[PDB]
Design a protein around this ligand. Structure first.
Ligand SMILES: CCCCC/C=C/C/C=C\CCCCCCCC(=O)O[C@H](COC(=O)CCCCCCCCCCCCCCC)COP(=O)(O)OCC[N+](C)(C)C
Ligand SMILES: CCCCC/C=C/C/C=C\CCCCCCCC(=O)O[C@H](COC(=O)CCCCCCCCCCCCCCC)COP(=O)(O)OCC[N+](C)(C)C
Ligand SMILES: CCCCC/C=C/C/C=C\CCCCCCCC(=O)O[C@H](COC(=O)CCCCCCCCCCCCCCC)COP(=O)(O)OCC[N+](C)(C)C
Ligand SMILES: CCCCC/C=C/C/C=C\CCCCCCCC(=O)O[C@H](COC(=O)CCCCCCCCCCCCCCC)COP(=O)(O)OCC[N+](C)(C)C
Ligand SMILES: CCCCC/C=C/C/C=C\CCCCCCCC(=O)O[C@H](COC(=O)CCCCCCCCCCCCCCC)COP(=O)(O)OCC[N+](C)(C)C
Ligand SMILES: CCCCC/C=C/C/C=C\CCCCCCCC(=O)O[C@H](COC(=O)CCCCCCCCCCCCCCC)COP(=O)(O)OCC[N+](C)(C)C
Ligand SMILES: CCCCC/C=C/C/C=C\CCCCCCCC(=O)O[C@H](COC(=O)CCCCCCCCCCCCCCC)COP(=O)(O)OCC[N+](C)(C)C
Ligand SMILES: CCCCC/C=C/C/C=C\CCCCCCCC(=O)O[C@H](COC(=O)CCCCCCCCCCCCCCC)COP(=O)(O)OCC[N+](C)(C)C
Ligand SMILES: *C/C=C(C)/C=C/C=C(C)/C=C/C1=C(C)CCCC1(C)C
Ligand SMILES: *C/C=C(C)/C=C/C=C(C)/C=C/C1=C(C)CCCC1(C)C
Ligand SMILES: *C/C=C(C)/C=C/C=C(C)/C=C/C1=C(C)CCCC1(C)C
Ligand SMILES: CCCCCCCCCCCCCCCC(=O)O
Ligand SMILES: CCCCCCCCCCCCCCCC(=O)O
Ligand SMILES: CCCCCCCCCCCCCCCC(=O)O
Ligand SMILES: CCCCCCCCCCCCCCCC(=O)O
Ligand SMILES: CCCCCCCCCCCCCCCC(=O)O
Ligand SMILES: CCCCCCCCCCCCCCCC(=O)O
Ligand SMILES: CCCCCCCCCCCCCCCC(=O)O
Ligand SMILES: CCCCCCCCCCCCCCCC(=O)O
Ligand SMILES: CCCCCCCCCCCCCCCC(=O)O
Lengths: 255, 255, 255
C-alpha cells in the first residue's frame, strides 16, 4: 500500500488485492504456456506433416507470436506480485495503465503483417505505438485535456484501422479456403476486440464512471488472454495450414 | 501549474503559456501536414512521371521521412496541451529538454543514410543517440558537471559531424547535377543547423544566461520545422529526381 | 548527496565517492579505448592480411562489438560524474542497479549470435532483455517479493543458458582449430562470468548481507571490463582468424 497506513477507504485504490493477484497469476500461467507451445510447434517443422526446414531452422520472424505471449506472461507475473504485495509497489506494472501495451501492441501488428505480407510494415508499427502512447498520457492527465489526448489517439487509430481492414480484404482472396477460416477468426479478434479497448476508457472512472478500476483490471485480463493467446494460436494454425498447401503439397496461391 | 498556487513570479517557468501553446499547435499542423504529403507522394509511384512500382508498393525505408514528421507533429500536439494546461503537467514533453529528440534525431540520420547509401549506418545511429542522451543529462544536472555532460556530448558529436561531412562529399559526385541541387540544400540544413542546437545551450539560462526559456521554446519550434519538415521535403524531392534519372529514364550514376 | 545535509552516516550510501569516481573514470577510458581499437581494426580489411572488402566497407553487424564498448564507456563516464558529484544526482546511472545493462546485455548476445550464426536470434535477444528487467525489479522492491522477481529472472536465464551452451557446442566443430582457441576463451567468459552476476545478488546487502554496495560497484567495474572489453577483443580476433581461413586463403568450414 503506497500510503503508509494504506489506501484511503473508498478510494479507486481500495480494491480486493488478493483476488486481483490470483487472476493475474492464472493469466500468467495460461499465456506463458500458450507461448511455450507456440515456439515448440514452430520447431517441429513445416505444416501438419512437420516437414523439415531446409536450413534446419525456422524463419526468425515466425518466433514473434510465441515471444509476444512470453513477454505478456512475464508481465502478468510481475503484476501478480504487485497485487499480492497490496499495490502501489516501486516496480508496478499495474500503476501506469497502458504502459505494458506500449511493448506488445506494436509487436502484435508486426507479427500479423509479416504473416500476411501486408505493405507498410513500418507505418503500421508506428501508428500503433503512437496510439498506445496517447493512451498513457490520457490516463495520467487529470484535466479535461485527458480527452484531448484520447482524441489525438483516435486520430491515429481510426485511419490505421480502416487502412488495415482494406489491406487484409485484399490478401484474403489470395489464400486457399482452409486458410481463410483461420484468418477470419483472427480478423474478428482484431476488428472486434481492439475497438473494445477505447470504448472501455469512456465508461471507466476517467470517463462516465460506470466501471470501477478493479473491474477494469479483470476485463483487461480477459482481453489480453484473447488478444495475445487466442490470437497467437490462430496465427500459428494459419501458418500450419498455409505451409501444408504451399510447401508440403507445393501448390500456388491465387494472387 | 506544478506549484499549487502556480509558478513563482519571475521564475524560469513564469512564461506566456497561451502563446507557447499556440505556436506549438501551429507547428503541429504544419509538420503533420508535411509528413502526410510526404507519404502520399511516395505512394504515387517512382519519379515525377509517377512510374508504377513493380511490387506495387514502395520500399519500406522510404517511409521514414514522412513517419518522422508525423511523430514530431504528434509530439508538438502533446506539447501544445501542456502549455494550454499552463505547464508542469504529469505527461509533459516540455519538461525534460531533449527527451523528445532522443526518438527523432537518430531516425533522421537513418533516413539520410538510407537515402544516400552512406556506410556505417549503425555507427551513425548510435553516435546521434548518445549525443542526445548527453544533452538530457546536461539539462537535468544542476552542478558544474552539467558541463562535463555537455563536453561528453561534443566528444560524440564532433567526430560524427566530420565523419559524415567526408562521406557525403564522397557520394555527392556519384549523383547527377539536378540531384546535386537538392542534396546541397539538405547539407546546408544538416551542416548549418544541427550545430546551432549546442550553440544555443551555451547562451541559454543554463550557460551565459542570454536567452530565456520561453525564447528557447520558440527558437526550437522554428528549428524543428526546418530540421524535420523542410529536410523531409528536400529528401523527398531528391528521391523523385534520382528515380526520374535511374528508373524512369534508366541512366547510370557516375560512381 | 541526495539528502540536503548528505547521506546519513553508516547508510548503504555512506561510501567513498572519490575512489568510486576514479575507478569508473579508468574503467571509462579503457573500455572506450578498446572499443575504438575494435572499430579501427575492422576498417582495415579482412583477416590478418587486411584483405580489402569488395564493397569497400565492412558488414554492418561487425560494428556491434565496438559499439557496445563505446556505449559502456560512455555510461562509465556518466557514472564517474555522479560519484564525483557525491552521489544521488538527478541523472544517475549508479542509482537503479541493472538499468544500464538493459541496453548492453541484449546487444552483447546479438553480437555473439551474429558472429557464430546461432539460430533464434530474436528468442535469444528477448530472453536476455527480460532477465535484466527482472533484476531491475528485484533491486527496487523492498519486500520479500524481491526474491519472487529474482526467481522469475532465473526462470528466463536458466533455459537460455542451457540452450546457448547446446547451440555453441554444435558450431564449435564447424570451425578450424585456430578459431576454436578464441571461441573457447569467449565461452569461458560467457559461461564463467555471466553466472557470477546472479550469485553476487545473493551475497549483497539485498541478500545475505556479506558484500557492501561500495564493494558491489567495484566488482561490477571489473566484471564489465571483462564482459565487454575482453569479450569484444576475443570476438574481434575470432573474426580475423576466421577470415584469414575462409576469405584470404579460401578454405571451407567442416560444417
Ligand atoms: C484458438 C482456437 C483453436 C482452433 C484450432 C483448430 C485445430 O484443431 O486445428 C487443427 C490443428 O490443431 C493443432 O495443430 C493444435 C492447435 C491447438 C494447440 C493446443 C493449444 C495450445 C495452447 C495450450 C496452452 C497451455 C496453457 C497452460 C487442424 O488439424 P487438421
Ligand atoms: C526504426 C528503424 C526501422 C528501420 C530499420 C531498417 C530496416 O527496416 O531495414 C530495411 C529492410 O526492412 C524491411 O524490408 C523490413 C521491414 C520491417 C522493419 C521492422 C520494424 C521496426 C533495410 O533493407 P534494405 O535492403 O533497404 O537495406
Ligand atoms: C496510420 C495508417 C497506417 C497505414 C498506412 C498505410 O499503409 O496507408 C497507405 C494509404 O492508406 C492510408 O493511409 C489511407 C488513410 C489516410 C489517412 C490520412 C490522414 C488524415 C497504404 O497505401 P496503398 O499501399 O493502398 O496505396
Ligand atoms: C523545401 C523546398 C522545396 C523545393 C521543391 C522544389 C520543386 O518545386 O521541385 C519540383 C518538384 O515539386 C514537387 O513535386 C513538389 C514539391 C513540394 C511539395 C509541396 C510541399 C509539401 C508540404 C506541404 C505542407 C502542408 C502543411 C499543412 C521539381 O519539378 P520538375
Ligand atoms: C541494435 C540492433 C541492430 C542490429 C540488427 C540486425 C541488423 O541490422 O540486420 C543485419 C542487416 O543490417 C543491415 O544491413 C541494415 C543496417 C541498418 C540497421 C538499423 C539500425 C538500428 C543482419 O543482416 P545479415 O544478412 O547480416 O543477417
Ligand atoms: C562517431 C562516428 C560515427 C561514424 C563512424 C564511421 O563511419 O567512421 C569510420 C572512420 O571515420 C571515423 O570515425 C573518423 C573519426 C575517428 C574518431 C576517433 C575517436 C577520437 C568510417 O571509416 P571509412 O568507411 O572511411 O574507412
Ligand atoms: C583478450 C586477449 C587477447 C589475445 C589476442 C591474441 C593475439 O595476439 O592474437 C594475434 C592477433 O593480434 C592482434 O591482431 C591484436 C590483438 C590485440 C589488440 C590490442 C588490444 C586492443 C585493446 C587496447 C585498449 C586500449 C585502451 C586505452 C594473432 O596473430 P597471428
Ligand atoms: C529462453 C531460451 C532462448 C533460446 C530459445 C531457443 O533457441 O530454443 C530452442 C529450443 O531449446 C529450448 O528452448 C530448450 C529449453 C526449453 C525451455 C522450456 C521452458 C520451461 C532451440 O531449438 P532447436 O533450434 O535446437 O530445435
Ligand atoms: C494486447 C493489447 C492490445 C491488443 C491492446 C490494444 C489497445 C488499443 C487498440 C487501444 C486503443 C486506444 C485508443 C484508440 C485511444 C485511447 C487510448 C487507447 C490505448 C485506449
Ligand atoms: C530534430 C532535432 C534535431 C535535428 C536536433 C539536433 C540536436 C543536436 C545535434 C544537439 C546537440 C547537442 C550536443 C552536441 C551537445 C549537448 C547536447 C545537445 C543535444 C544540445
Ligand atoms: C555487461 C553485463 C553483463 C554481461 C551482465 C550480465 C548479467 C546477468 C546475466 C544477470 C543476471 C540476473 C539474473 C539471472 C537474475 C536476477 C537479476 C540478474 C540481473 C542479477
Ligand atoms: C475533443 C475534446 C477535447 C477536450 C479537451 C480540451 C479542453 C480544454 C478546456 C479547458 C478546461
Ligand atoms: C467487457 C465487460 C463489460 C463491462 C461489464 C460491467 C462491469 C461491472 C461494473 C464494475 C463496477
Ligand atoms: C469478460 C469480462 C469479465 C467481467 C468482469 C466483471 C468484474 C466485476 C467485479
Ligand atoms: C570541460 C568542463 C568540465 C566542467 C565540469 C566538471 C567540473 C567539476 C568541478 C567541481 C565543482
Ligand atoms: C536563433 C535565434 C537567436 C537568438 C535570438 C535572441 C533571443 C532574444 C532574447 C530572449 C530572452
Ligand atoms: C527564428 C527564431 C525566432 C526568434 C525567437 C525570439 C522570441 C523572443 C520572445
Ligand atoms: C521463491 C521465493 C519467493 C519469495 C517471494 C514471495 C514471498 C512473499 C511472502 C509474503 C511476505
Ligand atoms: C568477485 C569478488 C568476490 C567478493 C569479494 C568480497 C568482498 C569484500 C567485502 C565487501 C564489504
Ligand atoms: C575482482 C574483484 C575486486 C574485489 C573488490 C573488493 C573491494 C572491497 C572494498
Amino acid at each position: 500500500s503506497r500510503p503508509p497506513e494504506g489506501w484511503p477507504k473508498g478510494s479507486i485504490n481500495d480494491m480486493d488485492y488478493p483476488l486481483l493477484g490470483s487472476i493475474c497469476a492464472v493469466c500468467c500461467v495460461f499465456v506463458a504456456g500458450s507461448g511455450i507451445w507456440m515456439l515448440y510447434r514452430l520447431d517441429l517443422g513445416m505444416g501438419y506433416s512437420c516437414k523439415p526446414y531446409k536450413s534446419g531452422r525456422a524463419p526468425e520472424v515466425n518466433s514473434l507470436s510465441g515471444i509476444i505471449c512470453l513477454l505478456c506472461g512475464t508481465m502478468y507475473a510481475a503484476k501478480s506480485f504487485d497485487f499480492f504485495d497490496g499495490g502501489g509497489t516501486p516496480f508496478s506494472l499495474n500503476w501506469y495503465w497502458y504502459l505494458d501495451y506500449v511493448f506488445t501492441c506494436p509487436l502484435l501488428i508486426l507479427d500479423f503483417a509479416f504473416t500476411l505480407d501486408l505493405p507498410h510494415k513500418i507505418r503500421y508499427f508506428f501508428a500503433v505505438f503512437l496510439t498506445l502512447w496517447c493512451g498513457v498520457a490520457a490516463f495520467v492527465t487529470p484535466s479535461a485535456y485527458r480527452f484531448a489526448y484520447y482524441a489525438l489517439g483516435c486520430c491515429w487509430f481510426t485511419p490505421f484501422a480502416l487502412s488495415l481492414m482494406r489491406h487484409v480484404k485484399e490478401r484474403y482472396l489470395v489464400y486457399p479456403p482452409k486458410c481463410q477460416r483461420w484468418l477470419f477468426w483472427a480478423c474478428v479478434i482484431f476488428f472486434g476486440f481492439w475497438p473494445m479497448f477505447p470504448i472501455l476508457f469512456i465508461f471507466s472512472w476517467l470517463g462516465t464512471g460506470h466501471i470501477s478500476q478493479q473491474a477494469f483490471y479483470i476485463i483487461f485480463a480477459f482481453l489480453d488472454l484473447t488478444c495475445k493467446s487466442i490470437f497467437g494460436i490462430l496465427m500459428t494454425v494459419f501458418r500450419l495450414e498455409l505451409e501444408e498447401h504451399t510447401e508440403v503439397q507445393g501448390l500456388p496461391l491465387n494472387e
